[PDB]
Amino acid sequence: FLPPVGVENREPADATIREKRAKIKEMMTHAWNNYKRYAWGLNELKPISKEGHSSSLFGNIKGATIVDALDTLFIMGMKTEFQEAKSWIKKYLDFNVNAEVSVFEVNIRFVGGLLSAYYLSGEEIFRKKAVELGVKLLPAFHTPSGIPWALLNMKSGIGRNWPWASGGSSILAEFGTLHLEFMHLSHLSGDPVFAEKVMKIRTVLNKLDKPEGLYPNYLNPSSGQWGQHHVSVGGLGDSFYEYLLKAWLMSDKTDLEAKKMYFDAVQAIETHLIRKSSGGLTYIAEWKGGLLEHKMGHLTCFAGGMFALGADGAPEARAQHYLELGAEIARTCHESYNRTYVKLGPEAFRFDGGVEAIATRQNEKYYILRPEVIETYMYMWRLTHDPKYRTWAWEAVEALESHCRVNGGYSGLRDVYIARESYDDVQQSFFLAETLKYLYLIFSDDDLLPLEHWIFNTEAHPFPILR
Ligand SMILES: *[C@@H]1O[C@H](CO)[C@@H](O[C@@H]2O[C@H](CO)[C@@H](O[C@@H]3O[C@H](CO[C@H]4O[C@H](CO[C@H]5O[C@H](CO)[C@@H](O)[C@H](O)[C@@H]5O)[C@@H](O)[C@H](O[C@H]5O[C@H](CO)[C@@H](O)[C@H](O)[C@@H]5O)[C@@H]4O)[C@@H](O)[C@H](O[C@H]4O[C@H](CO[C@H]5O[C@H](CO)[C@@H](O)[C@H](O)[C@@H]5O)[C@@H](O)[C@H](O)[C@@H]4O)[C@@H]3O)[C@H](O)[C@H]2NC(C)=O)[C@H](O)[C@H]1NC(C)=O
Ligand SMILES: [Ca+2]
């Protein structure tokens, strides 16, 4: 174990920034203390019902919110809370269970949360548990190609793909968002097997022709060939792209394959998917066999920070281009917040049918406590220090406090366009792992989890550079 760099949370110099940061910590005490009060040990909290919530993505594993919150608690100086969480994990976190889990979700939340807790604290239990879980996920890769199953029974090792997935195919974002965690699993366990699995994924992908430079969201694990040619930088695709860039950064820039894959991918996305509305907003559309659908998801909004984070490493005279593209995605995504009643954006928003940056379908008007817009504000603040990004982040804080904060915690909303809240009764674990961590960091100095020394996984779990 090596002492971690930049884990001290010194108070900002400006009194107003100090006060704003203290508010975000207070919001975390509200989310955490209510989770502990009504749902301790269960995966998530139902804040209206004041009971536990057990998403099917996690099967019979326990304590998702405990594990997802560990690192946020640590950096906020919540040491009593961190110790209670550690004691529960030592006694009760068990991966020897008989149910199916999403390999992807368990990796980014449980493996990632345990890894960050270990690197921040040095407590060996976190390392031991991360490796235990990695070992349990290894049967997911038992396919003819090495492209893993979506869903794995932890006891039997038997896997399968989503039943609706084109021809029984695996999902790009799912198998493409294992890389960072598996590289650290090999480092800490000394066992090459984890890196071998994620490097085999690379081998399969690089053998395929990418239609127009684009990656279909579906890849069959038996044949190793594409399913239907649906392409998106939001759901089903998003974090695969994210992890190409971050694999390169986290390798101390030695993973040259990752770098080329990333910049090639983003150029094809710019050409075929990125458009400007008649009102002047930049958006990322979805592509289906050549035909654009002029719609962007809240999930897609993470891409603003991705583009900005990759700017420093971009080719000669392309760095400002990517900082500016990041800023335009940030602005569009801020407009999706601005044009609502509650000032929190919808799950999807459109740029045709006579609209710009608003939802039209009733079933896409919801907000489930998502971090991706605030995530992009954090990167834009740290990479430009333009005060507007702190201004926009604080607008979201005031919105959350006005419309999502309830007596029993924080709840998502079913319709951001009307006055009367319709609470969905789920406190998503990613609100504690991501939304509040990124808010806290925005109102901190740059030297708390400095971006030069820490690369965030897709669930806001910071990992150190591997040399
Ligand atoms: C968050 O959301 C808010 C909305 O809540 C956004 O605010 C809007 O921003 C718009 C874009 O900047 C802006 O549109 C411009 O409006 C200018 C006119 O404003 C003045 O007049 C209007 C109208 O008054 C008459 O009509 C009303 C009824 O509508 C009557 O009640 C009056 O008696 C008059 O008869 C006033 O309402 C305005 O006053 C309000 O707004 C002011 C701020 O604008 C406030 O200070 C006031 O207190 C008051 O609330 C003003 O007095 C237009 O001149 C301007 O027109 C240019 O742009 C057009 C659009 O260009 C793009 O799109 C086209 C189409 O695709 C492309 O061709 C172009 O290339 C561009 O891509 C262009 O078509 C024109 O030809 C002109 O070049 C423009 O329409 C809104 O006024 C503003 N609304 C409000 C209420 O504030 C805000 O931007 C969002 N973001 C942020 C960060 O806040
Ligand atoms: Ca993410």
Side-chain angles (χ1 to χ4, degrees), residues 277-281 334-335 338-339 343 356 392 395:
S277 73
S278 68
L281 301 177
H334 180 236
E335 284 305 325
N338 181 35
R339 299 168 189 198
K343 311 290 169 169
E356 291 187 32
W392 297 352
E395 293 165 7

Side-chain angles (χ1 to χ4, degrees), residues 149-154 156-162:
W149 298 119
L151 296 165
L152 184 68
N153 182 304
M154 297 288 272
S156 68
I158 298 167
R160 72 179 172 120
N161 275 341
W162 292 106

Side-chain angles (χ1 to χ4, degrees), residues 222-243:
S222 295
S223 69
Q225 306 309 300
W226 305 120
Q228 65 184 336
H229 294 182
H230 287 195
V231 177
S232 184
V233 183
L236 308 186
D238 51 15
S239 55
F240 159 71
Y241 308 106
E242 189 188 351
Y243 271 28

Side-chain angles (χ1 to χ4, degrees), residues 6 59 163-164 169 178 198 268 439-440 444 454:
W164 46 263
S169 290
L178 310 170
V198 293
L439 284 170
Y440 188 80
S444 291
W454 298 94

